Amino acid sequence: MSNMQLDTLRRIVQEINSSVSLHDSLDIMVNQVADAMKVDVCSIYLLDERNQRYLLMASKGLNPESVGHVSLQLSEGLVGLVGQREEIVNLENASKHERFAYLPGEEIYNSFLGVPVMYRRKVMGVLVVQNKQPQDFSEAAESFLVTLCAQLSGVIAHAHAVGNID
Amino acid sequence: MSNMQLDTLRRIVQEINSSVSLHDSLDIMVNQVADAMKVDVCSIYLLDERNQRYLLMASKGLNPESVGHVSLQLSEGLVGLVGQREEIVNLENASKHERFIYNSFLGVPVMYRRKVMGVLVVQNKQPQDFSEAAESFLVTLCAQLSGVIAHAHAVGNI
């Protein structure tokens, strides 16, 4: 038989790889991750070095109004911590860390899985998976997300290198 | 329990994430892929579009002096063929192919936005089948590599 989870990863990687723009790549990744994992929210925050902040650039599950208009400071909350530590932060029960989580509407998400997007030792962004209830996500999920983030890391680096001269 | 290819992909890409240059990334990739695939040779060729040639840029297993020296046109052998048809060529017995001592060859196009950046090759001396999971594993790593190579063009490393 087949390694169906690898096949799923390959399918998403190919769709991202053949996408025409940074925006399309990000949109494909968050929506496909949300479907493959069956999670409430998947979002990607990119480090905006001009404004020294992380900016929400795509999401499945957050209000689409928020995209391009919610930001976090570089040391702020769990997203900032993922970026500072350059480590996965996989919290089954994020409620225990909610008070100083400084997360970016009404909804409460009691699980948090943040994965750094790293290129050439530099943090390009943070991918966030959230769910309403506490959830224990396995090593497979971490490996899946790490691999997708590594693909996006070069798409993002390339976008910077061919974008505005800033 | 653990998905072997997912877990290996994670470990390899994490090493690439901490690379210091294009050349470091290519070296990490050839070494890590040779280990994962248990092959005698893993090589990466980059397309020099101007000259319509593939330049050997990194290798585990080939004569190191070949790197940055061996150059192939699109008509030349199986590397050329992979770039030309933008398709995986997977041959347990490479002599089967009229384009073809390494008996076994798997070549995978490195694509970025439907454009060929290069070719990743594994070769083995003793016959080796390369499974469907092996193809998917290499496709995934090539997609990862493709952004590295695109960025290298963008900043003028290549």
Domains parsed from chain A with CATH numbers = 2-166 (3.30.450.40)
Q: Which residues of A touch B13 (CB under 8 A)?
A: 146-147, 150
Q: Which of B126, B74, B127 has its CA nearest to residue B99?
A: B74
Q: Which residue matches tokens 């060929």?
A: B116
Considering only CB atoms, B143 lies closest to which of A2, A139, A151, namely A151
Which helix (DSSP H) or strand (DSSP E) does residue A165 occupy? none
Chain B residue with Cα closest to A163:
B154
Residues in chain B that come right before a backbone break, where C and next N are over 2.5 Å apart: 100
How many residue pairs bridge chain A and chain B with CB atoms within 8 Å of each other? 110
Q: In angstroms, what separates the C-alpha of A64 from chain B's closest C-alpha? A: 26
Strands across the sheet containing B115-124 = B71-73, B53-60, B41-48, B115-124, B104-112, B89-91
* Long-range contacts at A77-80 (CB < 8 A, ≥ 24 apart): A77/A101, A77/A102, A77/A103, A77/A104, A78/A102, A78/A103, A78/A112, A78/A114, A79/A45, A79/A54, A79/A103, A79/A104, A79/A114, A79/A126, A79/A128, A80/A54
Helices A4-17 & B4-17, crossing angle to 10 degrees? 40
Alpha-carbon distance of B90 to B74, in angstroms, equals 17
Considering only CB atoms, A161 lies closest to which of B5, B6, B155, namely B155
